[PDB]
DNA sequence: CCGACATCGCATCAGC
DNA sequence: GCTGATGCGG
DNA sequence: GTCGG
């Protein structure tokens, strides 16, 4: 929060750039300068100061310096102005409705939450849940829930099969006090990146958590990513849980720890690092880490046994999962 | 100046 | 049906 | 919008 004004005006215009100019490289060069600027520890006191950080060019430590003095940015405050911007806004708030579509809804009138509610029928399975679930989505989850709905998905998988190893990354597994969802990372020996042995693998625990009415909706489902919503149980006349958002990935079991750094997160960290790996000559993604060909082809997977491993072949020391929130 | 900017699963579509 | 491109999520 | 070469 040291520099919380900053930051919120490069994410709002962040937003602005991926949703309405559907510009998703200024949207990420904002996220950047504001990950950049989140970090530093220091109370920005000029543009100046700002543009020494990486990420931070001419453009935004002009909009720096014009914030410091007036306390806002005449650009977002127009573009919070206009109804077309506005609309189309608020409308990617809804899960399933991206910048395509909220800009086609608008130019059907379709613009208000109310509007999207008598016009179920002009949207897809995905949209639907997202709509429902609209104001519960918008809530962030508790670490001490992020526990109880642990124990309840570690639990109810061992039930299944006891050799299912299930990790809750993403925030969480970054020791964030709250999270905007659950993310399971799931394995079982029968699936590796040499066989799949066994079919399913999946579908039997997504099966095994609705039984128990813990996984009440499907946003979209594969052999390999579920997509969906959850909710704790309420005891007597206590009033309900909200409903919470949950992915769940089933990754070889011998790509763990490619896939747990994945998983981890944060998506900024993931885009850095990735970034990194290709300037020393490397390409990471959620199963393995390979050396780039002087072709620029990727060569075959080099071995992993730890998460440190994919540090050090990158050059990078290691960073415990809560230093990766970028 | 100018190309690169991380990576990929599932849903939906158009074209054949 | 298939594939490949696009959207949206990650 | 930013950066390296
Ligand atoms: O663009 C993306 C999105 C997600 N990810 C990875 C990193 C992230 O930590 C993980 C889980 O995705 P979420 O959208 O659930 N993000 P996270 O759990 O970090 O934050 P939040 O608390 O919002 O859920 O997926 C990427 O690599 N790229
Ligand atoms: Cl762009
Ligand atoms: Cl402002
Ligand atoms: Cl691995
Ligand atoms: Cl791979
Ligand atoms: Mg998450
Ligand atoms: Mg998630
Ligand atoms: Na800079
Ligand atoms: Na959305």
């Known amino acids: 929060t040291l520099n919380g004004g900053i930051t919120d005006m490069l994410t709002e215009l962040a937003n602005f750039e991926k949703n309405v100019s559907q510009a998703i490289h200024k949207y990420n060069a904002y996220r950047k300068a504001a990950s950049v600027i989140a970090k530093y ?13 990486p990420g931070v060019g001419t453009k935004i430590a002009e909009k720096i310096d014009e914030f410091l003095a007036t306390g806002k940015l005449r650009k977002l405050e127009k573009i919070r102005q206009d109804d077309t911007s506005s609309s189309i806004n608020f409308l990617t708030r ?56 642990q124990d309840i998905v570690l639990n109810e998988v061992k039930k299944v099969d006891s050799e299912y190893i299930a990790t809750v990354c993403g925030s969480f597994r970054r020791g964030a006090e709250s999270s905007g969802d659950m993310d399971v990372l799931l394995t079982h020996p029968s699936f590796t990146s040499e066989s799949t042995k066994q079919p399913k693998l999946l579908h039997q625990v997504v099966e095994q958590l609705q039984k128990v009415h813990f996984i009440t909706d499907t946003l979209s489902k594969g052999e390999t990513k579920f997509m ?45 690092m990735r970034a990194h790996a290709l300037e020393k000559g490397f390409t990471i993604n ?9 072709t620029g082809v990727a060569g075959e997977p080099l071995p992993v046994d730890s998460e440190k491993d994919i540090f050090d072949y990158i050059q990078w020391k290691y960073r415990e999962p809560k230093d990766r929130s970028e």
């Open 228 to 272: 969906g919503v959850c909710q704790l149980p309420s005891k007597n006349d206590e009033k309900e849980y909200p409903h919470r958002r949950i992915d769940i990935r089933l990754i070889p079991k011998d790509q763990y720890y490619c896939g747990v750094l994945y998983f981890t997160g944060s998506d900024i960290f993931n885009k850095n």
């Open 286 to 294: 959620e199963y393995t880490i390979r050396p780039l060909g002087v």
């Open 41 to 53: 520890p220091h109370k920005i006191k000029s543009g100046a100061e700002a543009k020494k950080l």
């Open 94 to 149: 809804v899960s399933g409705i991206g910048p395509s579509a909220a800009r086609k809804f608008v130019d059907e009138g379709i613009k208000t939450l109310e509007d999207l509610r008598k016009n179920e029928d002009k949207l897809n399975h995905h949209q639907r849940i997202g709509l429902k679930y609209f104001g519960d989505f918008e809530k962030r989850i508790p670490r001490e829930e992020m526990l109880q709905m």
